[PDB]
Structure formats: structure tokens, C-alpha cells
Coordinates of C-alpha atoms (C1' of nucleotides) in Angstrom, one line a residue:
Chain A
X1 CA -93.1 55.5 -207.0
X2 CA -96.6 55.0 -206.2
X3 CA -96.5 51.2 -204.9
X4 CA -94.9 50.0 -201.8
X5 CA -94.6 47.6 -199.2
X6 CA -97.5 48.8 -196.3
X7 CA -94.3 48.9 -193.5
X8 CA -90.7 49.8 -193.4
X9 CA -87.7 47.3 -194.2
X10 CA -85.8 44.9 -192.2
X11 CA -81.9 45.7 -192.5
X12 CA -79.8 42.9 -193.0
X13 CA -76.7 44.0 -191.1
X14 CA -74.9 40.7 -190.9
X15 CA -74.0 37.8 -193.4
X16 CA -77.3 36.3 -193.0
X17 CA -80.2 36.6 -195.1
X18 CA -83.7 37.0 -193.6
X19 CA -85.6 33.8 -192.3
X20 CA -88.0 33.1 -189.8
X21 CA -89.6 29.7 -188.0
X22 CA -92.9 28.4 -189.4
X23 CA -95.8 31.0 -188.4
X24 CA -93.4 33.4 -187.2
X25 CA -92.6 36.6 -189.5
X26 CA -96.1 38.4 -190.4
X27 CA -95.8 42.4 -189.1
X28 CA -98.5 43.3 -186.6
X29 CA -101.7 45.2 -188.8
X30 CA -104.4 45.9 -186.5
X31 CA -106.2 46.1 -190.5
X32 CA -105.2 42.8 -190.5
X33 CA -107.2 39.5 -189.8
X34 CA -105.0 36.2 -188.9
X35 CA -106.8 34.9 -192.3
X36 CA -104.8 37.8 -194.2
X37 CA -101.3 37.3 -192.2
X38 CA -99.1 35.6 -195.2
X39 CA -96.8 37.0 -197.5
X40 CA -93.4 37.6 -198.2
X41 CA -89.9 39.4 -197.7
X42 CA -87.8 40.4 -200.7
X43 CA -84.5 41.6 -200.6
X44 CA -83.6 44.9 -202.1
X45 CA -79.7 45.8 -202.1
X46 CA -79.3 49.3 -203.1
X47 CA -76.1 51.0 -205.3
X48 CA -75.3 54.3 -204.7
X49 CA -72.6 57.0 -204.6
X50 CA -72.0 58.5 -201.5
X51 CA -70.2 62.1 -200.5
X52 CA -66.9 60.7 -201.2
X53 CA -68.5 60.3 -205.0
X54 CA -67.6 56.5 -204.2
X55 CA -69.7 53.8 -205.0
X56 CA -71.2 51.5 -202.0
X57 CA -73.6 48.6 -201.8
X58 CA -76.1 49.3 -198.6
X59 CA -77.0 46.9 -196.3
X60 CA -79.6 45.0 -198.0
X61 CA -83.2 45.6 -197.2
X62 CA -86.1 43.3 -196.9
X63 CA -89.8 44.6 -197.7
X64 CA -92.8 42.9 -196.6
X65 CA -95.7 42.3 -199.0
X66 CA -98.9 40.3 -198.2
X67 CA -99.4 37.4 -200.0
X68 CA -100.4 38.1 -203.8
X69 CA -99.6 41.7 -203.4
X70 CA -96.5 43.7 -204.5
X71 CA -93.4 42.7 -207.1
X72 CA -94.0 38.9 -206.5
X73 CA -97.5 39.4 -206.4
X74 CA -98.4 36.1 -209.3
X75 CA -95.9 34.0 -207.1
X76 CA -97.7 31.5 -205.1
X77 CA -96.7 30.7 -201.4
X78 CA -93.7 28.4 -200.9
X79 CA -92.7 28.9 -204.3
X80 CA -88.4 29.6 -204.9
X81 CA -86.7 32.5 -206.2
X82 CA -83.5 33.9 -204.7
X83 CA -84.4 36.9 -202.6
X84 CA -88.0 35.6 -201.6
X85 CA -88.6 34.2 -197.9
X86 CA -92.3 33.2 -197.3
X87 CA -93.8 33.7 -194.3
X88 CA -97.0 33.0 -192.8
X89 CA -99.2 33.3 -189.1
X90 CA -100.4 29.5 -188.9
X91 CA -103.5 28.7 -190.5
X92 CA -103.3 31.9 -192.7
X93 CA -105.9 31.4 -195.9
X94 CA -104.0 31.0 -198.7
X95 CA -105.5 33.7 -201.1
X96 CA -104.6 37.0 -202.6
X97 CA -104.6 39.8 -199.9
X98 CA -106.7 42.2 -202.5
X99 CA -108.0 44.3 -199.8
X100 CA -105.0 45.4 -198.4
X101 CA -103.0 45.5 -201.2
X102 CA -100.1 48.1 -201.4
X103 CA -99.2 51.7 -200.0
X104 CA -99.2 55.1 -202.1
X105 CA -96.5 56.9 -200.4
X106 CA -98.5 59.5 -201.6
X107 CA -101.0 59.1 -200.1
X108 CA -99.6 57.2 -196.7
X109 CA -96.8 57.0 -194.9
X110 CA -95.3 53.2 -193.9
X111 CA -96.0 51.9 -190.5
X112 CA -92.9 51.1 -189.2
X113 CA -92.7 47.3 -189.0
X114 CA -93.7 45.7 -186.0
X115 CA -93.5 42.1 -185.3
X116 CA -94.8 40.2 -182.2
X117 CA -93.3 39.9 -179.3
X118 CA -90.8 37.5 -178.9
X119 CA -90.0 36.7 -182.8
X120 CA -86.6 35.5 -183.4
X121 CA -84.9 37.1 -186.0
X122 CA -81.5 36.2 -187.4
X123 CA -78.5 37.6 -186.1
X124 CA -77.3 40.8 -187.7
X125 CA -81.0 42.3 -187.7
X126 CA -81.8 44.6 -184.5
X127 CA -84.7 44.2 -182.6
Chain B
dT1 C1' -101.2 71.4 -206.6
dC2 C1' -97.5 68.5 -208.1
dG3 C1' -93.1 67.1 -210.1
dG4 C1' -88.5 67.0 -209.2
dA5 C1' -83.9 67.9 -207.0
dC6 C1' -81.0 66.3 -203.6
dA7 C1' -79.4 64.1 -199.2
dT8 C1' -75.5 60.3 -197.7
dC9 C1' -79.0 55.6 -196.3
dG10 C1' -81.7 57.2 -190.6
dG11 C1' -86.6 56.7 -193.8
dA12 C1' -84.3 57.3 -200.6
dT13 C1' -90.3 51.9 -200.8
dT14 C1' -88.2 58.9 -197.3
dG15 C1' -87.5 63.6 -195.7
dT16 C1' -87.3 68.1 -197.1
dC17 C1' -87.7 72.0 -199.9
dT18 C1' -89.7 74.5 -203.5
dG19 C1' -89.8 75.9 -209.1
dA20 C1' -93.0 75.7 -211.9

DNA sequence: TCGGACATCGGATTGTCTGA
């Protein structure tokens, strides 16, 4: 409603769920330091009716949140729960990202999520 | 201004329109 993640999802097209190699994964933020690039992915799988007035189960999404921010925002890094892949740029400061926090789509649109080039991403997500 | 209806999932964590 009025809290989001700060970029667009990852669509999970294929069987696998989202992962990435150690200090791969942060989006690009040029309101980002390499202190603040650590958070999270969590998966959002959606249930809706479509035209047909069928039910369908989209494509999972998965949302980026800095660390400390968003749904799993009490969760500390590293910590497990189904749904929840950590990521983190290396030598990221493990500390709540405050000052970034999350987006008002009311206020601002999601930048469309950008990761560095070169980042592997599982097959089944388009790059 | 702003809440809400609705689309067909693209972006619904939005886009678009518009009644109130």
C-alpha cells in the first residue's frame, strides 16, 4: 500500500528459486554506498483469477529489501526462513539500512532492478 | 486532492481512469 521494495521484482520463470554467489545479488543504487549494499530477496507467489474467471498461481516474484528494511526487516542477515535469500556486496556493514528504507508508491515510482554487470542469475530468470 | 475500481500479470509492490 504505502511500503515497498525500492526496485521492481525478479520473476522466477523456471523451477528454481532465486540464489546468487557470495557478494553477488545487491541491485545497483547510485543512493547507495557499498557499506549499505546488503539485504534480502523474498518470494511473493501471487493467486489470482484471470479472464477465463479461472484461478492461476503467477510466476513467483522476488522483492529486494535492504537489510533491516521491509517485511523481514527484525530478521538479521544469514538468518533461515523459506522464501528469504540473503545477499550482500563484500564487506557490506552489517546494520539496519534506516536511511534508505522503503518506497511510497505514492510518492515514487520503483527503479527497475538493475544488477551489475556480469551477475549470474539462475536459470529461468531473464537477464 | 484522493480513494477506489479494474485490468489479465507487462508493472497489480502498477497503470489507468475518474467518482466523489
Amino acid at each position: 500500500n504505502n511500503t515497498a521494495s525500492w526496485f521492481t521484482a525478479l520473476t522466477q520463470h523456471g523451477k528454481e528459486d532465486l540464489k546468487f554467489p557470495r557478494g553477488q545479488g545487491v541491485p545497483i543504487n547510485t543512493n547507495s554506498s557499498p557499506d549499505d549494499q546488503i539485504g534480502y530477496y523474498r518470494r511473493a507467489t501471487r493467486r489470482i483469477r484471470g479472464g477465463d474467471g479461472k484461478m492461476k498461481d503467477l510466476s513467483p516474484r522476488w522483492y529486494f529489501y535492504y537489510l533491516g528494511t521491509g517485511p523481514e526487516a527484525g530478521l538479521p542477515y544469514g538468518a533461515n526462513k523459506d522464501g528469504i535469500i540473503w545477499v550482500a556486496t563484500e564487506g557490506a556493514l552489517n546494520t539496519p539500512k534506516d536511511h534508505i528504507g522503503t518506497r511510497n508508491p505514492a510518492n515514487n515510482a520503483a527503479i527497475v532492478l538493475q544488477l551489475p554487470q556480469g551477475t549470474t542469475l539462475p536459470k529461468g530468470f531473464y537477464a
